[PDB]
Symmetry: D2
Subunit: 115 residues, 4 copies
């Protein structure tokens, strides 16, 4: 599993469950092309987005649909979504976890990249 | 000042100085049209991007060029940039401060929104 | 102003107003002696805690009373308080801004340290 | 496992490995009494701190020794340590994860409390 996404809710102190996540890969024409997507699980995680074969070097965007999450909880939010944009780099073996910690008017994102 | 951007460096405990910032507004055809740009000052702040007249309702994107900032400090960071996307002024004019706290493999961002 | 505290509310996107803050300094006997206290203003800021003369070298603790803040907004939060512990002025006087960004089950804190 | 601690490094994009963590429980005399401790693993985690039997309601402090972590990496830090103080509350079955994301001049902590 070369790419995993984990989303946490700082208001409820819980995983952020059933959050839509869309991954895009930058194309040669510099547009964003759909790459993978899903909804976070009961543990706030989304696994199985891609494979080592498909996840080649390039620029990727992970879009987390935070606004719909806050709306569905009856809470007013600031952002349309959280976007995480990064270059995948081969530099020996690699696994990427994109984590996000959500509040209505703030989010934090970190990358945990391990071998 | 209806839109201000403040950027801090969590490695040095300092304002993040000379960080490029580009603001876009979603157009009627769903494209991101350039709206304003600038660079943070020695206080980590960017003022004067727009005016209450210009800053109409819409969906805005604030792109903060974090990668260039880190590379200049000798660090190869994770993110290309930090992007903040939000609807503004849809209940009338507000003042927005977009703050970002930067680390090489993480950032946070928060909005402070006040009613003048 | 050598020590300032700024507190923001990540639920409302606003300054965190009326938050109690207590500052302590570690004494020669390793106890935490009260040093200064106050409450954040309508801008979320607390100024005037100390002076360059009073704010000598030492280990300081800034306790921010986040639990009371949230309970007053109807929220039962996780943390009792947010505590920020740091050595100050050990290379001469500096100006410290201690910032905190609050959510019911999370907080962050960062320091901005400048040399006057 | 009613209490777990997870520590991440925002400078290296990695778990924070071999970080000392001390847990205290507030005593009747309002002093902090040592409760459990350990060092984070290669995954930045510390498991096995306590048991359901021992982890009764009360006020707890988790102290993460961030200064020694940054010093050992050759990096100058701001804080002496990060402290997380909370009340454990029985309210049906519960598991507490105390997570921290570390930078030299900033840290973020969140609680993930699940059943
Ligand atoms: O404290 C945190 C904890 C975690 C976290 C990340 C992955 C996990 O499996 C987990 O249990 C917790 O991610 C964060 C991610 C961010 Cl961006 C900020 C944080 O403070 C945290
Ligand atoms: O601690 C912080 C402090 C500030 C901050 C500091 C000074 C300001 O005038 C302001 O508007 C914001 O912004 C943050 C912004 C974020 Cl996203 C996270 C933080 O921890 C902070
Ligand atoms: Na409207
Ligand atoms: Na000294």
């Amino acid at each position: 599993c070369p790419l995993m996404v984990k989303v946490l809710d700082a208001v409820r102190g819980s995983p952020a469950i059933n959050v839509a996540v869309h991954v895009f890969r930058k194309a040669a024409d510099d547009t964003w092309e759909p790459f993978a997507s899903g909804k976070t699980s009961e543990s706030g995680e989304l696994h199985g987005l891609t494979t080592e074969e498909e996840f080649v070097e390039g620029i990727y965007k992970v879009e987390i649909d935070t606004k719909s999450y806050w709306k569905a909880l009856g809470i007013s939010p600031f952002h349309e979504h959280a976007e995480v944009v990064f270059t995948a780099n081969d530099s020996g073996p690699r696994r990427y976890t994109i984590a996000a910690l959500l509040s209505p008017y703030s989010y934090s994102t970190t990358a945990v990249v391990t071998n």
